[PDB]
Amino acid sequence: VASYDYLVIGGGSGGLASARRAAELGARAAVVESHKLGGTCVNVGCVPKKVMWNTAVHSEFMHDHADYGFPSCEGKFNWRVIKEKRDAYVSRLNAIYQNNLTKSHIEIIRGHAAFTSDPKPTIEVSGKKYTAPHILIATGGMPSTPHESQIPGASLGITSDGFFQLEELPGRSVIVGAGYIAVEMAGILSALGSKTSLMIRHDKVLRSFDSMISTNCTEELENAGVEVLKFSQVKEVKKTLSGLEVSMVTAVPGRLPVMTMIPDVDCLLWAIGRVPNTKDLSLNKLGIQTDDKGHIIVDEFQNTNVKGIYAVGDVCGKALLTPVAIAAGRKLAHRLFEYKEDSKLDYNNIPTVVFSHPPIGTVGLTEDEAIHKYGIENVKTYSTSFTPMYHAVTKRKTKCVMKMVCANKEEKVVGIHMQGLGCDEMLQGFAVAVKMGATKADFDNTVAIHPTSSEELVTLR
Amino acid sequence: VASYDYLVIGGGSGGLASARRAAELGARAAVVESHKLGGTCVNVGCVPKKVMWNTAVHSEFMHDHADYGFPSCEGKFNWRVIKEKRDAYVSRLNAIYQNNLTKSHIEIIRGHAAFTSDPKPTIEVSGKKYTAPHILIATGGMPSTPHESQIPGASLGITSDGFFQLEELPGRSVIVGAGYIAVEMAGILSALGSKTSLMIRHDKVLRSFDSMISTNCTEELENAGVEVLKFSQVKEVKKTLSGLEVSMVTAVPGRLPVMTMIPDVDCLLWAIGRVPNTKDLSLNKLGIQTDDKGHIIVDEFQNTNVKGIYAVGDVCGKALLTPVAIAAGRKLAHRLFEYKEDSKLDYNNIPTVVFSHPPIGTVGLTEDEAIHKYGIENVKTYSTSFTPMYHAVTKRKTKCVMKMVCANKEEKVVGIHMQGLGCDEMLQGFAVAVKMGATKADFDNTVAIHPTSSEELVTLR
Numbered sequence: 066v067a068s069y070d071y072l073v074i075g076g077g078s079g080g081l082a083s084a085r086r087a088a089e090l091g092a093r094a095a096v097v098e099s100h101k102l103g104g105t106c107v108n109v110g111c112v113p114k115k116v117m118w119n120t121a122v123h124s125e126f127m128h129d130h131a132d133y134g135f136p137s138c139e140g141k142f143n144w145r146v147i148k149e150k151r152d153a154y155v156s157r158l159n160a161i162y163q164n165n166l167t168k169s170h171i172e173i174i175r176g177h178a179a180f181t182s183d184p185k186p187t188i189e190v191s192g193k194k195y196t197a198p199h200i201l202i203a204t205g206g207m208p209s210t211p212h213e214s215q216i217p218g219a220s221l222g223i224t225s226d227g228f229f230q231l232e233e234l235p236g237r238s239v240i241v242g243a244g245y246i247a248v249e250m251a252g253i254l255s256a257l258g259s260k261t262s263l264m265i266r267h268d269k270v271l272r273s274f275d276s277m278i279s280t281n282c283t284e285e286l287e288n289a290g291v292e293v294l295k296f297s298q299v300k301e302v303k304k305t306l307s308g309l310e311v312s313m314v315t316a317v318p319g320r321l322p323v324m325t326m327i328p329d330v331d332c333l334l335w336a337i338g339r340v341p342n343t344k345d346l347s348l349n350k351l352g353i354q355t356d357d358k359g360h361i362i363v364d365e366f367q368n369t370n371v372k373g374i375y376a377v378g379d380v381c382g383k384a385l386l387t388p389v390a391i392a393a394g395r396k397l398a399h400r401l402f403e404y405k406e407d408s409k410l411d412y413n414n415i416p417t418v419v420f421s422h423p424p425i426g427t428v429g430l431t432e433d434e435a436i437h438k439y440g441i442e443n444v445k446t447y448s449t450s451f452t453p454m455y456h457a458v459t460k461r462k463t464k465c466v467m468k469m470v471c472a473n474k475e476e477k478v479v480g481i482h483m484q485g486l487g488c489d490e491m492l493q494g495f496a497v498a499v500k501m502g503a504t505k506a507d508f509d510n511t512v513a514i515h516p517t518s519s520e521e522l523v524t525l526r
Numbered sequence: 527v528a529s530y531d532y533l534v535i536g537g538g539s540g541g542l543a544s545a546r547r548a549a550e551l552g553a554r555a556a557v558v559e560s561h562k563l564g565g566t567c568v569n570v571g572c573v574p575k576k577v578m579w580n581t582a583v584h585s586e587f588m589h590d591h592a593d594y595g596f597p598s599c600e601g602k603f604n605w606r607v608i609k610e611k612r613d614a615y616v617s618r619l620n621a622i623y624q625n626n627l628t629k630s631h632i633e634i635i636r637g638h639a640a641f642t643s644d645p646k647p648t649i650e651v652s653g654k655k656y657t658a659p660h661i662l663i664a665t666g667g668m669p670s671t672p673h674e675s676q677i678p679g680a681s682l683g684i685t686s687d688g689f690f691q692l693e694e695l696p697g698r699s700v701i702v703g704a705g706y707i708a709v710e711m712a713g714i715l716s717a718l719g720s721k722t723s724l725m726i727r728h729d730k731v732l733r734s735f736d737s738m739i740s741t742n743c744t745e746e747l748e749n750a751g752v753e754v755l756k757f758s759q760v761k762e763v764k765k766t767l768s769g770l771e772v773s774m775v776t777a778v779p780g781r782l783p784v785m786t787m788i789p790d791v792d793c794l795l796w797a798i799g800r801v802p803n804t805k806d807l808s809l810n811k812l813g814i815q816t817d818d819k820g821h822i823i824v825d826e827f828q829n830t831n832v833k834g835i836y837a838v839g840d841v842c843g844k845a846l847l848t849p850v851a852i853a854a855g856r857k858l859a860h861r862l863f864e865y866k867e868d869s870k871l872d873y874n875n876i877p878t879v880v881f882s883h884p885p886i887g888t889v890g891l892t893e894d895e896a897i898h899k900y901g902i903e904n905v906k907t908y909s910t911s912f913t914p915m916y917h918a919v920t921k922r923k924t925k926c927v928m929k930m931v932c933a934n935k936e937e938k939v940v941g942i943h944m945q946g947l948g949c950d951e952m953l954q955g956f957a958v959a960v961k962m963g964a965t966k967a968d969f970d971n972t973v974a975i976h977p978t979s980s981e982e983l984v985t986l987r
C-alpha cells in the first residue's frame with residue numbers, strides 16, 4: 066500500500082484546488098481521476114457553456130446592427146464551426162491543468178477509485194491499493210434523467226452533457242426544467258435559432274430566487290421568443306418518422322388538465338437535476354453517511370462521520386458552484402496542513418450569476434428569506450427598473466431590474482438581486498461589500514460612475 | 527429684488543442636483559441657465575459620448591462575427607443615422623430634466639447671470655435682479671483651444687463640442703492631446719473607420735494614471751490601428767485645396783527634431799484641456815477668489831472666500847466628473863438646509879472609468895502615489911495580465927490587466943487599476959469595498975464568480 070499525506074478522489078474543481086494548495090504546504094499528494102482533469106467545470110460545464118453564451122450574445126447584437134447605423138447582417142449561423150473551436154479550447158485547458166499538477170509534484174493516478182474493507186481508510190485503483198491519513202472525496206455529480214418506468218421513452222432525450230456533443234443546431238427543441246441550467250440552455254438554443262420551448266412545472270423559472278428575478282426572468286425569456294409551457298410535464302416520449310413526439314399534460318390550477326402532443330422535436334433536453342457521484346465508491350464499506358439522494362454528509366469543516374475522510378463540492382449537495390468547491394477545498398488544505406483549525410468556508414453570502422439573456426446576478430438573501438429571518442417590520446427593500454442606455458436607439462429592448470434587501474435600523478445590506486446587461490461582471494465587487502457587512506449608507510457614500518448601469522445600485526432611494 | 531432661499535447659477539450636473547435636494551428639504555430655489563438644462567453631461571458630454579462608444583463597440587464585435595460562426599458583415603457605417611438618433615435621445619433627456627425641475631417647484635430663470643456691485647450678494651439676469659442668502663456657482667467649463675498667436679490656423683480645428691455636431695464621418699482625423707477625452711475620441715473615430723492619428727507630447731497617454739494603465743492603454747490604441755505620434759506637437763495648421771495640412775514637430779529625446787507635414791486632414795480635434803466658465807460672472811465685483819486659470823477657489827465644504835457663496839463642479843477645477851459635481855452639490859444642500867455641518871464630499875477614492883477600447887476602471891492611489899505616501903517598504907502590489915475568455919476563439923485580441931495596490935501590514939487596498947472587456951461595469955462594487963477600507967483578505971475571503979473576468983480581482987496571489 067503506497068502511502069501519501071493526502072489522497073484526493075476526483076480531479077475536478079474541488080479536488081484539484083485542494084490537492085494543489087496542500088502540495089504548496091508540503092503535503093505529498095496524489096489525485097485519482099477516472100476521466101478528464103478539470104472535471105465538469107472544464108469539460109461539460111462552465112467553460113463550454115460560457116463560449117456558447119458568448120456566441121448567443123453575438124446573435125443578439127447582430128439583431129441591433131442596423132439600428133446602430135450598419136447594414137444588416139444576414140444570419141446563417143454555423144454550429145460546427147464554433148463547436149470545433151470550443152472543443153479545441155477545452156483541449157488546451159486539459160493540457161494546462163495536467164501541467165499544473167506536474168509542476169506542483171502531485172501524482173495523478175488514472176482510474177476509478179473505490180474504498181476497501183481495510184480497517185484504516187484505504188482505496189484501490191485498478192488492483193493497486195493507496196492510503197493516506199487524510200482522504201478527500203470530490204467526485205462531483207451527474208445529470209439526472211427520468212426513469213423509463215415513470216416516463217416511457219425518457220431515454221430518447223439528452224442531458225446537458227449530450228448538449229455539448231451536438232454537432233448540428235436542432236431545429237426544434239424542448240427543454241424540461243426550471244432551474245438555471247434549463248434557463249441557460251433555452252436561452253442559447255433560442256438565440257442561435259432553434260424553435261425553443263421551455264417546459265416548467267409551475268408558472269415561473271428559478272423559483273428559489275428572489276421573486277423579482279423569477280418573474281422578470283420568465284418575462285424576458287418570453288420576450289426573447291422562448292415558449293414557456295407552464296404547469297406542464299412530460300407524460301411520454303416517442304420516436305416518430307421525423308423527430309420525436311412529446312406528450313405532455315398541462316394542469317393549470319382552476320382548469321381541467323389538457324393533454325397535448327409536441328411533434329417533430331429534434332432535441333429533448335432534460336434539465337431537472339443533478340445526482341451525486343457516490344454509488345461506486347463502496348462508501349458502505351467504511352460506513353460513511355449519505356442522505357437518501359446519495360449525497361455525502363459533512364459538518365462545517367467538510368468532515369464526514371469517519372475520521373480522516375472529508376468531502377467537498379457537488380458530492381455534498383450544497384451550493385453547487387465551481388468557486389464553492391474550490392474555496393472549500395483550499396480552506397480544508399489550510400486546516401489540515403497549516404494547522405488552522407478555524408479554517409472553513411462560510412456558506413453565507415455566496416454570489417451567483419446565471420447566464421441568461423440578460424444575465425442575472427444574486428448574492429445574499431431574497432426578500433422572503435430576510436422577512437423570515439428579521440421579521441417584516443425590520444426589512445426594507447429598494448428597487449429600480451429601467452431600460453439600459455444601450456437600447457436608447459434600438460427597436461429590440463431588454464430591461465434592467467435591481468433590488469437591495471436591507472435589515473434592521475442601520476439598513477445592513479443582506480441581499481442584492483439584479484438582471485440586465487452587464488450584470489455578469491457587475492456582481493463581484495458588490496459581493497465583497499456585502500461580505501464585509503456594508504449598510505445602505507456605505508453604498509450611498511460611494512461616488513457613482515456615470516454613465517453605467519452599475520451606478521443605479523449606489524443611488525437607490 | 528426677488529428673494530429666494532437658494533439661487534443656483536448653472537443648470538448642469540452640480541447645479542441641478544443641488545437645487546433639487548435643497549427643494550426636497552423645503553428651500554425655495556431657482557436655477558439660472560443660459561442654455562440647455564442637463565449642461566455638459568447631457569448635451570456634449572457623458573450621454574452623446576456613451577452612445578458613440580456603444581456604436582464603436584458594435585463595429586469591433588462585427589469584426590469577430592465570422593470567428594463566431596456567422597457570415598461576415600460588410601461594414602459601411604452610416605454616421606448620420608446614429609447622429610440623428612443620438613440627437614433625438616438628448617432631446618428626450620432635456621424634456622425630462624425640465625419636467626424634473628417643475629415637479630420639484632424649482633423656478634428656472636433663463637439667461638446669463640452676472641453678479642452686481644450690490645453689497646449683499648446679488649445677481650442680475652436680463653435686467654432683473656435676484657438675491658438669496660445662499661448662492662451656488664455651478665457654471666462648469668469649456669474646451670480649451672490654442673491661440674492663433676502661438677499656433678497659426680489653430681481655429682481651423684474643432685473641440686469635443688464640435689465633434690458632436692459632425693454630420694459625416696471624417697476620412698482622416700488627427701486628435702491632439704493625451705488625456706481621457708483625447709483617448710476616447712481617437713478610439714471612437716478609429717473604430718468607426720476614420721484613419722486616425724493621436725498626437726501626444728510625450729510617449730504615453732493618460733500619464734497621470736498608474737503606469738501599468740498608461741503603458742497598456744498606449745499599446746491597445748496602437749493594436750487597434752490608432753497612429754500614436756509621440757513627442758510631437760502642432761506648429762501650424764493651414765487650409766489646403768482638400769482638407770487641412772498640419773505641420774508638426776517631433777522631438778524625441780536623444781535625436782534631432784524633425785518637422786513633418788500631415789496633409790489631407792479632414793478633422794483636427796483639440797483635446798488639450800478644459801477652461802472654467804467664470805469670465806463673465808463679474809466675480810471681481812464681490813472679490814471672489816480664483817486661481818490664475820480662472821477656477822473659483824473653495825474650501826472642503828465648497829465655500830468660497832465670501833460668505834453665502836459656494837461653488838461646485840468643473841468650475842472649481844478638481845475631479846472633473848459628473849458624479850462628483852452631483853455628490854458635492856447634494857452634500858452642500860444637506861449642510862445648508864438640513865443643518866448637517868459635517869456634510870461635505872470626501873475627494874479620496876473617487877472612481878473613474880475611461881471609455882477606451884477596452885475600457886479602463888480606476889479608484890484610489892496609483893503605485894507611485896502609494897509609494898510616496900507610505901514608503902516603498904510599506905507598499906505591496908499584486909497584478910495579473912490575461913486574454914479574456916471571449917477571445918479564446920477570435921483572431922483579434924485584447925488583453926485584460928489588473929493591479930491592486932496595498933498599504934501597511936494588513937494590506938489595506940488603497941488602489942485598483944484595470945483595463946479590459948467589462949471593466950466599465952465591474953468597478954462600482956469594488957469602489958464601495960475600497961471606500962469601506964477593505965484589506966486584501968476581505969477580497970480574498972469573497973467567493974469568486976466563475977467564469978468572469980471580475981473573479982481575477984478576488985484571486986490575486
Ligand SMILES: Cc1cc2nc3c(=O)[nH]c(=O)nc-3n(C[C@H](O)[C@H](O)[C@H](O)COP(=O)(O)OP(=O)(O)OC[C@H]3O[C@@H](n4cnc5c(N)ncnc54)[C@H](O)[C@@H]3O)c2cc1C
Pocket residue numbers: 074075076077078079080097098099100101102103104105106109110111114176177178179203204205206225246342345346377378379380384385386387388390976977
Ligand atoms: C451545464 C453546467 C453549467 C454550469 N455552469 C456553472 C457556472 O457558470 N458557474 C459555476 O460556478 N458553476 C457552474 N456549474 C457547476 C460546476 O460545474 C460544479 O459545481 C463543479 O464542477 C463541481 O466540482 P466538483 O469538484 O464538486 O466536481 P466535478 O467538477 O464534477 O469533478 C468530479 C471529478 O471526479 C471524477 N470522479 C468521479 N468519481 C470518481 C472515482 N470514483 N474515481 C476517480 N475519479 C472520479 C470525475 O470524473 C470528475 O472529473 C455548472 C454545471 C453544469 C453541469
Ligand SMILES: Cc1cc2nc3c(=O)[nH]c(=O)nc-3n(C[C@H](O)[C@H](O)[C@H](O)COP(=O)(O)OP(=O)(O)OC[C@H]3O[C@@H](n4cnc5c(N)ncnc54)[C@H](O)[C@@H]3O)c2cc1C
Pocket residue numbers: 515516535536537538539540541558559560561562563564565566567570571572575637638639640664665666667686707803806807838839840841845846847848849851
Ligand atoms: C466630451 C466629454 C466627456 C465626458 N465624459 C464623462 C464621463 O463619461 N463621466 C463623467 O463623470 N464625466 C464626464 N465628463 C465630465 C462631466 O461632463 C463634467 O464633469 C460635468 O458636466 C460638470 O458639471 P458642472 O455642473 O460642473 O457643469 P456643466 O455640466 O457644464 O454645467 C454648467 C451649466 O451652467 C451654465 N452656465 C454657465 N455660465 C452661466 C451663467 N453665467 N449664467 C447661466 N448659466 C450659465 C452652462 O450653460 C451649463 O449648462 C465629460 C466631459 C466632456 C466634455
Ligand SMILES: *SC[C@H](NC(=O)CC[C@H](N)C(=O)O)C(=O)NCC(=O)O
Pocket residue numbers: 077078079081082085103106107111112387388391974976985
Ligand atoms: S473551469 C475549472 C476551474 N477553474 C477556475 O475556476 C479558475 C480558478 C481561479 N483562477 C482561482 O481561484 O485560482 C477549476 O477547476 N480550477 C482549478 C484551480 O485549482 O484553479
Ligand SMILES: *SC[C@H](NC(=O)CC[C@H](N)C(=O)O)C(=O)NCC(=O)O
Pocket residue numbers: 513515524538539540542543546564567568572573848849852
Ligand atoms: S447626464 C446628466 C446627469 N445625470 C446623472 O448623472 C444621473 C444621476 C443619478 N441618477 C443620481 O445620482 O440620481 C445629471 O445632471 N444629473 C442630474 C440629477 O439631479 O440627477
